[PDB]
Amino acid sequence: SMLKYSTNMLELAMPKINKIVNGTDLTPHYLSEPNKEFKIYRYNNEVYAVRFENDEPMDYVLMWKSHGRHPREFYEEINLHIIEQQFFLKYHGIQEHFVLGLWNIKNEENVYFYMPKINAIPINKKIDQPKIEEFVLALKELNDAGYWHPDLANNPYHISPQNLIATEEMVKTIDLDGGFRYDKGRVDELSRKSLVYGKDQWLYVYNFIYPPTDEEDHRIDWRVPIEKWYENNRDESLSDNPHTLLRFYHEGLISLPKKLAHDLHETILEE
């Protein structure tokens, strides 16, 4: 009985990676036959990417919970980028804040991007503020790396509140059609602008939620001072100019997450 209880706990302590790779193999839906670095499995209604090296499973990441003429290889290269994004986020400790899908390439005549679904509720400013701050800082970490959400805050004048949700543990963002955006090297003005907006995306989300107010308690149109500064500092983001970010903050023109203001000040203190 203590015996039987020790036998149950032992079965449960089996390393999870071994259980995952004996699940349903979904790899042909997302990667082609001769690829040998990743396999994709569904284990107990959850879909995982597993990294391999010489037939041995090395690492795994949980991607989601289950319920225009390009070649298939074009989309498979994107999927390999997304899978590497998942592991990159895991070892930055922020992967759980993002619900990312993949291009389904099973049928060459019906290639489609699966946007994973979730059981979750909309966020609420008063109740969820600690989780909101935690998510916004995770998004800034992603933005700092040069990646951004394609439909959350395209610029200071755009917001998609429906793509933020809360579970009972945390706030996540969803519905990234085609995955993260990033710099592809184009030099037209719109791409130059989008790069700046992508670096500062987290700031737009935060000030949408917690907009600053003036001496009369009216909402400040924080978008105007920011857009004016972008105009006079082309190809420059506030996130890459922390001293300017903090000056806007202390003038009351933008809000910042408490921990970010703390950390930026402590860094400047020690330099």
What does this entry list as its resolution, in Å? 2.1
Q: Structural domain of residue 168, as residue ranges? A: 125-269
In terms of C-beta distances under 8 Å and separation of at least 24 residues, what long-range contacts does 237-246 make, across chains too?
237/195, 237/196, 237/199, 237/200, 238/199, 238/200, 238/203, 239/140, 239/143, 239/144, 239/199, 239/200, 239/202, 239/203, 240/199, 242/267, 242/268, 243/268, 245/203
57 and 9 within one domain: yes
**150 shares its domain with 208:** yes
Q: What is the DSSP letter of 220?
A: P
Q: Give the end of a domain, one of 80, 108, 136.
A: 108
Contact 191/184 with Cβ under 8 angstroms? yes
What length does the chain have?
Answer: 271
Token pair 């590497």 in the structure block, residue? 84
Using the 3D structure, point to which of 50, 77, 108 is the last residue of a domain.
108
Give the up-direction half-sphere exposure of residue 196: CA atoms within 13 A in the CB hemisphere. 21
> Is 115 part of a structural domain of the chain?
no
* Short-list 211, 195, 210, 81, CA closest to 143: 195
* Phi–psi pair at 30, nearest 5 degrees: -135, -30
**H or E element at residue 40:** strand 38-43
Residue 184, domain member (yes or no): yes
Specify if 43 maps to a domain. Answer: yes
Task: List the beta bridge partners of residue 182.
Answer: 147
CB 137 within 8 A of CB 180: no
Q: How far is CA 208 from the centre of its chain?
A: 18
Which helix H or strand E contains 144, and what residues bound it?
Answer: helix 125-144
Please tell me whether residues 88 and 182 are part of one structural domain.
no
Q: Do 97 and 173 sit in the same domain of this protein?
A: no
Q: Are 63 and 47 in contact (CB under 8 A)?
A: yes
Report the DSSP beta bridge partners of residue 64: 47
Assess contact for 83 and 136: CB atoms under 8 A.
no
Amino acid at 154: N
Backbone angles phi, psi at 41, to 5 degrees: -130, 150
Is 150 found in the same domain as 91? no
**Is residue 117 included in any domain, yes or no?**
no
Would residue 120 count as lying in a domain?
no
- What is the distance, to the nearest Å, from the Cα of residue 206 to the centroid of all Cα atoms in its chain? 15
Residue 55, sorted as left (phi over 0), alpha (psi -120 to 50) or beta, turns out to be left
DSSP string covering 100-113: --EEE-SSTT--EE
Q: Bridge-partner residues for 112, per DSSP? A: 104
Q: Are residues 139 and 260 in the same domain?
A: yes
> 112 is written with which tokens?
């489609």
Contact 64, 116 (CB under 8 A): yes
Residue 180 lies in a domain: yes
Q: Is there a single domain that holds both residue 130 and residue 259?
A: yes
Reading the block at residue 232, the tokens are 């006079």
85/131 same-domain check: no
- DSSP secondary structure, 65-92, as one string: E------HHHHHHHHHHHHHHHHHHHHT
CA dist., res. 64 & res. 150, Å (int): 19
Please check whether residue 45 lies inside any domain of the structure.
yes
Cα separation, 32 vs 116, whole angstroms: 21
Residues contacting 79, CB < 8 A, separation 6+:
30, 31, 102, 103, 105
Q: 206 and 215 in contact (C-beta within 8 Å)? A: no
Query: For residues 86 and 61, is the Cβ–Cβ distance under 8 A?
Result: yes
Q: Given the structure tokens 């449960």, which residue do they identify? A: 12
Cα 152 versus chain centre, distance: 11
Inter-residue contact 151 to 176 (CB < 8 Å): yes
Based on the fold, state whether residues 130 and 260 are members of the same structural domain.
yes
Q: Is residue 114 part of a domain?
A: no
Q: Are residues 136 and 94 in the same domain?
A: no
Number of structural domains, the chain? Answer: 2
Q: Is 103 left (phi over 0), alpha (psi -120 to 50) or beta?
A: beta
3-state secondary structure of 171: strand
CA pair distance 35, 102, nearest whole angstrom: 16
Structure tokens at 161: 């509140």
Query: How far apart are alpha carbons 138 and 97 in whole angstroms?
Result: 7
- With vertex at residue 82, the alpha carbon angle to CA 163 and CA 117, rounded to the nearest 5 degrees, is 35
